[PDB]
Amino acid sequence: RTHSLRYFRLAVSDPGPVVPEFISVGYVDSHPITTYDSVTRQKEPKAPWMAENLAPDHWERYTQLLRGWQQTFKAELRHLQRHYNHSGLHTYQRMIGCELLEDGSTTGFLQYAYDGQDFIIFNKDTLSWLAMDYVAHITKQAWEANLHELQYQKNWLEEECIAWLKRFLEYGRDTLERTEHPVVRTTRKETFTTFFCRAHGFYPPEISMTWMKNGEEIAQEVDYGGVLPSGDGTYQTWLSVNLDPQSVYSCHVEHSGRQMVLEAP
């Protein structure tokens, strides 16, 4: 397994509708937990197990930091657009976080992006920033001029970040470690025949579907649709195998220890 905690930040130079000037959303195992934007100017929980375990003090201090960080982040976009002599709409993005893998080996990442492309990347082992263009090099030498910060980065990315994540995973362990089994059915879409094996409504987004020919032969001429989200917190997937009027296909589905074999007409 693996668990991760990520905090993104976005800055646009045109606060249009449905896109604020500054956005910052935290994620745990690709699940929204926190949210902030210049329209609300308040940090809010994106999950119910976040609002019940985090005291109202945690939603009052980090707002102030985010309010300050909003001014800094929007300022950095202005400073970059000067170096590039850019005007109009441009995006400045940030990713920071850690992930706690199985076998204990933790990692730490922190990187920026300008207009979708990577701008500068931090190395917590070398205590240095990696530049992609000359403008990012001027940023590197300025950021690498305050050793108090680079050493602060390594501590958070390695020690502080994990402590939040382990604290966060214990919160909402009932939701983050839930188990809901799929509704698996098989259909028939004939040629202008293709059989479909679809599952619906499983929370743990790891499900295996293998379509078996005769009694024992894995059909290799198959198509796969990814685990799409549904909206209710569950996912869904499908797999197709173009058949032929042969004188026996079976779909094998396993999800969280519930193995199920289905016919195929």
Epitope: D57, Y62, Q64, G68, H148, Y152, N155
Partner: antibody, heavy 107, light 115 residues
């Protein structure tokens, strides 16, 4: 949250290590400040990783697991007799200020 | 760099005392502490930018306002003897993250509230 001694004596021309022991929730840094009588605090050194920071006329050590740091002041003179403050940063970024150690130097 | 006015003040119990601070360092963060004998430096109010004003550890009886970037005044609407202390104004660059901040203190302000 942060505990600190209140007095220290050492001969002129010798050294003096001033201790600091924090019990904060998280830890984002440890900063030393020098406040001398009527004057205002002056930043001395910031330390967040384990090790010794050989700044020259002083040094700073930090032990994260023990939750302990000391400031090693060397080549002391009379002007260095002051009070030394250590402030630690919370897991929510709050400076927890200690009570300060009054270092007095013997002439 | 960082200065404070008035440098000294002798107020009466139930008076209007406004301790203002001015900075030349282009810093977005300014603070207000008070140094008492038993306790360490204790925050009263701070600000992360012009207009924003938040509370600290001891906002009891204290008000603060940041009219401009360079000024962050501590307003004492009703003065009381328990507010007699030496107050210190600080500054910090918000670009150095929130952890590596080096507070630049201004000089003291000896306030005394008498009956």
């Amino acid at each position: 949250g942060v505990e600190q001694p209140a007095k220290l004596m050492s001969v002129e021309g010798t050294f003096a290590r001033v201790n600091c022991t924090y019990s904060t929730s998280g830890f984002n840094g440890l900063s030393w400040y020098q406040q001398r009588e009527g004057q205002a605090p002056v930043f001395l050194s910031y330390v967040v990783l384990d090790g010794l920071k050989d700044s020259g006329h002083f040094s700073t050590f930090l032990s994260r697991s023990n939750g302990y740091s000391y400031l090693l002041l060397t080549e002391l003179q009379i002007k260095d007799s002051a009070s030394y403050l250590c402030a630690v940063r919370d897991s929510n970024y709050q400076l927890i200020w200690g009570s300060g150690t009054k270092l007095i130097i013997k002439p | 760099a960082v200065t404070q006015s008035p440098r000294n003040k002798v107020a009466v119990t139930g008076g209007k005392v406004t301790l203002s601070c001015n900075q030349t360092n282009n810093h977005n963060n300014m603070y207000w502490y008070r140094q008492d004998t038993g306790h360490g430096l204790r925050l009263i109010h701070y600000s992360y930018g012009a207009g924003s004003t938040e509370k600290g550890d001891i906002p009891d009886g204290y008000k603060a306002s940041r009219p401009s970037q360079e000024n962050f005044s501590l307003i004492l609407e009703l003065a009381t003897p328990s507010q007699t202390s030496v107050y210190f104004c600080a500054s910090g660059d918000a670009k150095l993250g929130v952890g590596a901040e080096t507070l630049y203190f201004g000089s003291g302000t000896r306030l005394t509230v008498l009956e």
